[PDB]
Amino acid sequence: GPEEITADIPNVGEAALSKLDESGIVYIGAEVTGGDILVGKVTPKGETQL
Amino acid sequence: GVLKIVKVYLAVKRRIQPGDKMAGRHGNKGVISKINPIEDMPYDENGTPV
Amino acid sequence: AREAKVLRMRFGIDMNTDYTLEEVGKQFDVTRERIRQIEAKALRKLRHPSRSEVLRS
Amino acid sequence: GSVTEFLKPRLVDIEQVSSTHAKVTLEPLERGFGHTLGNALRRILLSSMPGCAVTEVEIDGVLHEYSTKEGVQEDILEILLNLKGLAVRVQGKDEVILTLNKSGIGPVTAADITHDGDVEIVKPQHVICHLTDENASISMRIKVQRGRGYVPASTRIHSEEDERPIGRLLVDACYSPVERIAYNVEAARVEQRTDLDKLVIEMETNGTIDPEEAIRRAATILAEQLEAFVDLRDVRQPEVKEEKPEFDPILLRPVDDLELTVRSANCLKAEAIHYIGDLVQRTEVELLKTPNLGKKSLTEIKDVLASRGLSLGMRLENWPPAS
Amino acid sequence: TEFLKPRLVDIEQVSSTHAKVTLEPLERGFGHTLGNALRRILLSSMPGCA
């Protein structure tokens, strides 16, 4: 499948929308530090078995 | 490759951290050690330190 | 034991082939709903320990 | 106790040459002391002095500090550098927000600031802007605090304002109000003995602090620090912190971490529910009797609680230990 | 708002005359200022008969 740029990134908290918009890209003028997200992106991969 | 991409230009401002390679104009190489308060550097008859 | 084996056998851990509500309900007389009752009770127990909580992420 | 002779120092003529430069002479001084106090005071003055300095600036229509503005010859960073040297002197506060509106052709100084009744501006002639077109207009809410010793924005990564808007620009802070500090011993013509000196302390400040409260605050810090040089009990630390959480550490976090609606968040803030340690042990019986909390709000809570693994309205009569 | 006090204090007497004293909690330059001050006090401004 294709990889989409979204804000629905799994296993995230309020730090997500804190810097990122409704889309998944941080606002122009936002202050970031080591670890934060700049572009929300997810890649498809099922299986895994667990 | 495939699909859309996002570039994020973020600008940072670095101060003279202890270890930066700084030199003169006559092959005067040098690397800064410590930082040192103004309170304990060589001064003269006036308040002017170095 | 009637809760550890229940949790272990259902989600199939340390025994390879995992079984279902029936294959576990048959080996413990009372079928289906009864075993699911216990299965949910064991999950109830894990709501204070922090070990598996942090292991989550 | 009965030993020693010794003398005492006392302030003479504090010659105020200008609003910045100052000279505080100390005449009643011996030989050894007049040279010893010279360094103690010089360091505490060239460091451990109070003062004020800009920390935050929010400018309309300007997000980050790298942008510009129409009608402004200077760019935003430069205007942030000019506000660095704001000679401010606040009366009896720890934080003030001076507003600064100014429109039309011409240079915008520290005068175009809203003259507050508490803020005392040393040099209103100070440069900050330079509007160009007559249709150009600016307005910036400035923030000034009281502290000590440098401490830039780089120190506070995000330990202030959990949200802090896009428009808020952090500026560094040069707290100490003493530019240079010098001193000469010199033989004192004390109309008394013969072998005494007069510690002359040539001084240069910014005008945001007077030589009176300056040398006193300075010597006061030396005294307070010498205070421990008296007795020597050699007090150690007990240490030995407890390494055994009786409950899940998550119960320590506030309900903000639940990430729920504003209506439900305000309700929890009104029912005196701060930590999740109280929401986890509150029944639906008590949640229905809560002002402005209907079916949608209650479903929100159980869904944001269950997902974290926790339940709703459990019991744990161990709340809270144990500092 | 103000300043801090030195808390951890150690004193080892390598006899009755020779000794070492260490005070850890001190701000910038204070250790040296108090050093020069107390040094300049102990090397002349002290009483004693000879």
Swiss-Prot record, chain A:
Practical uses of the protein: Co-administration of salinamide and rifampicin or salinamide and myxopyronin suppresses the emergence of resistance to both antibiotics.
Post-translational modification comment from the UniProt entry: Acetylated on several lysine residues in the presence of glucose.
Subunit structure: The RNAP catalytic core consists of 2 alpha, 1 beta, 1 beta' and 1 omega subunit. When a sigma factor is associated with the core the holoenzyme is formed, which can initiate transcription. The rRNA transcription and antitermination complex (rrnTAC) consists of RNAP, NusA, NusB, NusE (rpsJ), NusG, SubB, ribosomal protein S4, DNA and precursor rRNA; S4 is more flexible than other subunits. In pull-down experiments interacts with CedA.
Function: DNA-dependent RNA polymerase (RNAP) catalyzes the transcription of DNA into RNA using the four ribonucleoside triphosphates as substrates. Resistance to the antibiotics salinamide A, salinamide B, rifampicin, streptolydigin, CBR703, myxopyronin, and lipiarmycin can result from mutations in this protein.
Family statement: Belongs to the RNA polymerase beta chain family.
The protein's name: DNA-directed RNA polymerase subunit beta
Protein species of origin: Escherichia coli (strain K12)
Gene: rpoB
Residues of the full protein shown: 846 to 895 of 1342
Curated annotation (Swiss-Prot), chain C:
Chain intervals for the UniProt region annotation (Sigma-70 factor domain-4): 1-48
Site (Interaction with anti-sigma factors) location in chain: R10
Domain of life: Bacteria
Result of changing A1D: Disrupts the interaction with Escherichia phage lambda antitermination protein Q
Subcellular location: Cytoplasm
Start-end of DNA-binding region: 21-40
Location of region: Interaction with anti-sigma factors: 32-47
Cleavable signal peptide: none
Stated family: Belongs to the sigma-70 factor family. RpoD/SigA subfamily.
Function per UniProt: Sigma factors are initiation factors that promote the attachment of RNA polymerase to specific initiation sites and are then released. This sigma factor is the primary sigma factor during exponential growth. Preferentially transcribes genes associated with fast growth, such as ribosomal operons, other protein-synthesis related genes, rRNA- and tRNA-encoding genes and prfB.
Assembly: Interacts transiently with the RNA polymerase catalytic core formed by RpoA, RpoB, RpoC and RpoZ (2 alpha, 1 beta, 1 beta' and 1 omega subunit) to form the RNA polymerase holoenzyme that can initiate transcription. Identified in a complex containing RpoD, the RNA polymerase subunits RpoA, RpoB and RpoZ, CRP and DNA. Interacts with Rsd; this prevents interaction with the RNA polymerase catalytic core and with promoter DNA, and as a consequence, promotes transcription from promoters that require alternative sigma factors. (Microbial infection) Interacts with Escherichia phage lambda antitermination protein Q.
Domain remark text: Contains 4 domains, connected by flexible linkers. In the active conformation, the domains are in an extended conformation, each making extensive interactions with the RNA polymerase catalytic core.
Identification of the protein by name: RNA polymerase sigma factor RpoD
Gene name tied to this protein: rpoD
From Swiss-Prot, chain D:
Residues covered by region (Alpha C-terminal domain (alpha-CTD)): 247-323
Entry note about domains: The N-terminal domain is essential for RNAP assembly and basal transcription, whereas the C-terminal domain is involved in interaction with transcriptional regulators (such as CRP) and with upstream promoter elements.
MF term (GO), any: protein dimerization activity
Family note: Belongs to the RNA polymerase alpha chain family.
Identification of the protein by name: DNA-directed RNA polymerase subunit alpha
Chain segments carrying region Alpha N-terminal domain (alpha-NTD): 1-233
Source species of the chain: Escherichia coli (strain K12)
Listed GO CC annotations: cytoplasm; cytosol; cytosolic DNA-directed RNA polymerase complex; membrane; transcription elongation factor complex
Claim: Transit peptide is one of the keywords in the record: no
